Each structure stands twice: as C-alpha cells, then as structure tokens.
Design a protein around this nucleic acid. Structure first.
Length: 109
DNA sequence: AAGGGAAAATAAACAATACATAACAAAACATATAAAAACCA
C-alpha cells in the first residue's frame, strides 16, 4: 500500500533539484478574499491575530504541495490543503474558547 | 443554542462584638431585744 522508502528518498532529491513551480494571476485573488474573512474573525472572537506571514506560509505550503505533486504550477486546490494546515495549527494553538472558530472555519473546510 | 459575565459562593486573615459566668450589691423578707410609750389600776 504505501510508497517505499528508497523511491521516496530518491524522489525528494529529484524534485528538490530540478523544478521551481510558480503561480499565475488568473484566479489566485480569491485567497486574498478568504484571508480577508479569516483575519477579521480572529479579532472579534480570538485574541491572537493573523498577519501577512501566514499568507506567505500558505503560499509556501501550496507550492511545496505542488512540488510534491511535480506540476508546472500550483493548482487551485493546493491552497485548500494549505488553509487546512494553517487552521489546524493556529486554531489548535489557542484556548477551548475559540471553539466557535472550529465551526467558523467549517464553511471553507 | 452559545456564551459573556455578573451574581453567588468559598476561603482566609483580622477586627469587633456578644456571651457565660464570677463577684457582688442591694432590696425584700425575717427575727430579736432594750428602750420608749401607752395604759390600766
């Protein structure tokens, strides 16, 4: 069932030394819309804010998933996994009182 | 339906007051006898 270890460690060195997947401005602006919701909802219920470093982090996580997918560019649904990775790290790094944010992020989950 | 958040509860240190009784005072209740005072005689 899983990928063997030797092929995986050879794939790491093969993908990290040959490709450089960029991003195209066709429909990527939608993540700036969802960040605009996700920043604002962290002020009213949460105490810790979300900044531009999280946007740089999800673009890096999406291009890392595109690097692992070995594509020419980042797809539209790589950002969905990137925003899931940032929601279950930032929301999980807080109190139990940000519990409404567990369902507030359920619309984009 | 969730949740904020103020009311309510708990605890602990400290201060302030009440309480049980000790010690006593004083008034009611009680008797005694020598001196006055009526009082028969």
């Amino acid at each position: 069932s899983p990928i063997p270890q030797e092929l995986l460690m050879k794939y790491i060195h093969y993908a990290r030394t040959k490709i450089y997947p960029k991003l195209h401005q066709m429909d990527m602006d939608k993540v700036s819309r969802v960040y605009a919701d996700l920043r604002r909802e962290s002020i009213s219920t949460g105490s810790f804010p979300i900044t531009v470093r999280h946007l740089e982090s999800i673009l890096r996580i999406a291009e890392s998933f595109a690097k692992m997918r070995l594509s020419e560019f980042v797809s539209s649904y790589d950002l969905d996994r990137a925003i899931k990775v940032v929601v279950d790290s930032f929301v999980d790094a807080q109190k139990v009182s940000v519990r409404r944010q567990l369902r507030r992020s359920f619309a984009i989950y």
